[PDB]
Paper text:
Here, we report the structure of the F. tularensis enzyme and show that it is fused to 6-hydroxymethyl-7,8-dihydropterin pyrophosphokinase (FtHPPK) which catalyzes the previous step in the pathway. DHPS acts at a crucial convergence point in the folate pathway, and catalyzes the condensation of p-aminobenzoic acid (pABA) and 6-hydroxymethyl-7,8–dihydropterin-pyrophosphate (DHPPP) to form the intermediate dihydropteroate. The N-terminal FtHPPK module is connected to the C-terminal FtDHPS module by a structured linker region, and the structures of each module are very similar to those of the monofunctional enzymes.
The two molecules in the asymmetric unit are very similar (RMSD of 0.4 Å on α-carbons) and differ only in the flexible loop regions. Regions missing in the final model due to disorder are residues 44–56 and 89–98 within the FtHPPK module, and residues 213–224, 304–318 and 354 within the FtDHPS. In addition, there was no observable electron density for the N-terminal 20 residues that correspond to the His6-tag. In one of the molecules of the asymmetric unit in the apo structure, one Mg2+ ion remains coordinated between the side chains of Asp101 and Asp103 in the absence of substrate, but the relatively high B factors of the ion and its coordinating oxygen atoms suggest that it is weakly bound. However, as anticipated from the sequence alignment, only seven of the eight surrounding α-helices are present (Dα1-Dα2-Dα3-Dα4-Dα5-Dα6-Dα7) with the carboxy-terminal Dα8 helix missing. The gap in the TIM barrel is partly filled by Lys421 and Ile422 that follow Dβ8 at the C-terminus, and by the flanking helices Dα1 and Dα7 that move slightly inwards to fill the space, but there remains a significant cleft on the surface of the TIM-barrel structure. In the E. coli and B. anthracis DHPS structures, there is an N-terminal β-hairpin that caps the N-terminal end of the TIM-barrel, but this is not present in the F. tularensis structure. The FtHPPK domain partially performs this role, but is shifted by approximately 30° from where the β-hairpin would typically be positioned. In both molecules in the asymmetric unit, D1 (residues 180 to 193) is folded into an extended β-ribbon and makes a crystal contact with a neighboring molecule via Phe189.
Residue numbers in the entry: 0 to 46, 57 to 86, 98 to 159, 161 to 183, 185 to 216, 221 to 303, 320 to 350, 363 to 422
The structure:
């Protein structure tokens, strides 16, 4: 027979959302588990901030078996916490486990996603306790970051197409805040624009911002994955040296020095984006084989059309996850090129909402 379980999932170290998807993927991988539904992402304060959700699963696993599975997944992914919140109306009391979880009614970050998945759930020991009133008595933020297949990469530009006052240079910080409130799961930080800048200057812009990011780590309701945008082998080297621990991906619009780049990225176990800078398949295909040739796993490679109607065809040919950067590009948005940042951002949300349905792995945007 099948039993419906709610699994609570929390994390507050490393790449938080990645840890959550990895735990879910691990569950889904079991031949005796089916994933019915995922809850939203919730952020709570560390007694840096926790990221919590819950998933509802169907399984023939007995509770104790299911607990064994959770412990192993925890050991594989300790930077993640997996708990059996509930099994419908089941009541199990033992030293090994109690269902519902002892602390469920004392943790808004547990009860909140649980009631989201099962709005009608009542605690089987307290069938008269209206858990919504209980939830309110407790002490929580429901993020706009989601567990969706398409993740949003928010653009944080450190260059000069973007404005200091006499005693205020807060613009880039405010915009990090904006992106995080609005659901960006990933931020892409770039220090160049669209006159060259030196290695040392590009590095300094990036580093000042990552050092700022780190100082805010516990102030962030959500710690996004970090992508660095640079075409320079040397800034990559410097930035990974100091900050690899918060960097998830490298976004590189320059095939110059690929071999050395691939060795670095391989060594640091980070994601790489191939950018185009039809036949386009083969361009990406060639670069693609070099990277593999230098030691980086194929799963870690994304491709990008590089605009500067049939992407799904291309991805499927390519064997690689799609990253799409359509934000504020008047051509692909089919707008006049004079249109204001207000109308550009509008058309782009409209199109973002469209690419989200096709399961584009990453969309890169200025605004959510
Ligand atoms: Mg635990």
């Amino acid at each position: 027979h099948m039993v419906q379980y709610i699994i609570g999932i929390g994390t507050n170290s490393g790449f938080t959302i990645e840890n959550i998807h990895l735990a879910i993927t691990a569950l889904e991988s079991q031949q005796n588990i089916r994933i019915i539904r995922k809850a939203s992402l919730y952020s709570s304060k560390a007694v840096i901030r926790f990221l919590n959700t819950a998933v509802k699963i169907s399984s023939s696993l007995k509770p104790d078996e299911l607990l064994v599975l959770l412990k192993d997944i925890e050991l594989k992914i300790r930077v993640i916490d997996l708990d059996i919140l509930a099994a419908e109306d089941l009541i199990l009391e033992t030293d090994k486990l109690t269902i519902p979880h002892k602390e469920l009614i004392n943790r808004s970050f547990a009860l909140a996603p649980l009631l989201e998945l099962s709005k009608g759930w009542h605690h089987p020991k307290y069938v008269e306790w209206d858990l919504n009133i209980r939830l309110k008595e407790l002490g929580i933020v429901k993020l706009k970051q989601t567990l969706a297949n398409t993740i949003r990469m928010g653009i944080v530009n450190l260059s000069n197409q973007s404005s200091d006052g006499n005693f205020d240079d807060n613009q880039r910080k405010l915009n990090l805040d904006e992106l995080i409130q609005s659901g960006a799961e990933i931020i892409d930080i770039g220090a160049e624009s669209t006159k060259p800048i030196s290695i040392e200057e590009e590095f300094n812009k990036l580093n000042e911002f990552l050092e700022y990011f780190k100082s805010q780590l516990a102030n962030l309701i959500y710690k996004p994955l970090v992508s660095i945008d640079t075409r320079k082998l040397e800034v990559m080297q410097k930035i990974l040296a100091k900050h690899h621990d918060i960097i998830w991906m490298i976004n590189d619009v320059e095939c110059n020095n690929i071999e050395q780049k691939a060795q670095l990225i391989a060594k640091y176990n980070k994601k790489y984006v191939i950018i185009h800078n039809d036949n386009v398949c083969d361009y990406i295909e060639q670069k693609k084989q070099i990277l593999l040739k230098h030691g980086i796993a194929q799963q870690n490679i994304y491709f990008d059309i590089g605009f500067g109607e049939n992407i799904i065809e291309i991805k499927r040919r390519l064997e690689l996850k799609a990253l799409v950067g359509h934000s504020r590009k008047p051509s692909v948005l089919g707008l006049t090129k004079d249109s204001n940042l207000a109308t550009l951002d509008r058309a782009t949300r409209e199109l973002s909402r469209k690419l989200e349905k096709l399961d584009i792995d990453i969309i890169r945007v200025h605004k959510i």
